[PDB]
Amino acid sequence: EKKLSDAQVALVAAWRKYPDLRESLEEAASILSLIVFQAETLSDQANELANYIRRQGLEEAEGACRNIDIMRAKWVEVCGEVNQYGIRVYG
Amino acid sequence: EKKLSDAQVALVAAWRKYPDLRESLEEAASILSLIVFQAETLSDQANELANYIRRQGLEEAEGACRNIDIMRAKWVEVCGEVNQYGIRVYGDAID
């Protein structure tokens, strides 16, 4: 039941309490954001490749395509999703 | 520039200095770790999709395979690569 937002809360809470931690934990926060962004870029790319494969009727890769769907749903549980207003929302 | 290990080390450094942060920041560290694990699991699946495409000779989607290679390379720049002994290694220490 752990979420991306939980980690983000903890990081800012930490250096607001202890300002000497600002430089290192804002950096960690930026690295976490970078990681999430890169992951979601590759995930979308994988999803679109999987969609293409399905449309081509290539049943040999059907297990793989199904795995991409399962993994994408699991990701949204932890990291939510960004809507059209640029807000990251959770279930 | 700055790597996954930098973030990892920063979390630990912080609660070693301020023990009262250990609960919140250990949790954060485990979330970071989970996110990296799920990303890398999906990445490996994406890589095998591309492998399948290329084995079939399906050139229509070759651009997607090149895209996946580029993104995996960029990921490894930041997050390194876990070797067969489960050690995450970076840069020229890979392969």
Author numbering:
A (entry chain C): 2 to 92
B (entry chain A): 2 to 96
Published text:
One mechanism by which phages and other mobile genetic elements are able to overcome the CRISPR-Cas system is through the expression of anti-CRISPR proteins. We previously reported that gene 34 from Pseudomonas phage JBD5, which encodes the protein AcrE1, shows anti-CRISPR activity against the type I-E system of P. aeruginosa strain SMC4386 (4). We show that AcrE1 binds to the CRISPR-associated helicase/nuclease Cas3 and that the C-terminal region of the anti-CRISPR protein is important for its inhibitory activity. In summary, these experiments demonstrate that AcrE1 functions by blocking the activity of Cas3 without inhibiting the DNA-binding activity of Cascade.
(c) Structural overlay of the X-ray crystal structures of the AcrE1 proteins with an N-terminal (blue) and C-terminal (red) 6×His tag reveals virtually identical structures. Thus, the unusual nature of the C-terminal sheet was not a result of the presence of the 6×His affinity purification tag fused to the C terminus. The C-terminal β-sheet region is unusual because both sides of the sheet are exposed to solvent, contrasting with typical β-sheets, which pack a hydrophobic surface on one side against helices or other sheets. We also examined the packing of the C-terminal β-sheet within the crystal and observed no contacts that stabilize it in this position. Residues 82 to 90 form an antiparallel β-sheet that protrudes at a 90° angle from the end of helix 3. This sheet structure appears to be stabilized by multiple interactions between residues at the base of the sheet and residues in helices 1, 2, and 3. A salt bridge is formed between E41 and R89.
